[PDB]
Amino acid sequence: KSCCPSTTGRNIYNTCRLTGSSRETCAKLSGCKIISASTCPSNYPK
Template structure:
């Protein structure tokens, strides 16, 4: 019984990690829609600064990025700005992969039989549906 509880606790940790990663990705989309950076280093400095709770203007000044009122960055400050035609696809694929690897793989490890294969397939479909609905609405907001 203790072993089952340990497996459940481990699975819960992975699920929480996947949700946190998804939130960071969606949060990054919202940040990138308003900030324009000239390099990968500048983008990383800006994102790290924002994670500490500093204001957008403070982080922009520190990193060399610019805050814009629109959502389209212009060269040379267009590094790592999400293209509206691809941002949803990238986040959607990340969501599906994270959900499937963290949630669905635990089913297979726990059961390890034919029944598990059916459950994993259903789980993959559920991840796909969840991500399609929630990622689509999140990228529209950004």
């Protein structure tokens, strides 16, 4: 699951994934974290 710090991070991540880039690649650009859980922590809630 992707967990993002901000709405901008969420948008960057989502956009990057439409390019077919990997979750790690997109996490880097967006400041998001890839976590294998069904929910996100309070510091990366988006």
